[PDB]
Steps between C-alpha positions, in 0.01 A plus 500: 500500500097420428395235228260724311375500105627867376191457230155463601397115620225430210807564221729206655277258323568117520640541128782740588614292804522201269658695214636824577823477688511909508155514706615172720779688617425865474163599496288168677729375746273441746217404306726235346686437807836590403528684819 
C-alpha cells in the first residue's frame, strides 16, 4: 500500500507515460501518477 515506480525513476520517461499503458500502470505509477 505505497505508490512507488518498481523500475528506476530516469526509465519512466515522459514518452512511456504518454504511450505505454504497461509502464503507466505497472512499472511508473507514481511517476505518472496513476497511484
Amino acid at each position: 500500500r505505497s505508490c512507488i515506480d518498481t523500475i528506476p525513476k530516469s526509465r519512466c520517461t515522459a514518452f512511456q507515460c504518454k504511450h505505454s499503458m504497461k509502464y503507466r500502470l505497472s512499472f511508473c505509477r507514481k511517476t505518472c501518477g496513476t497511484c
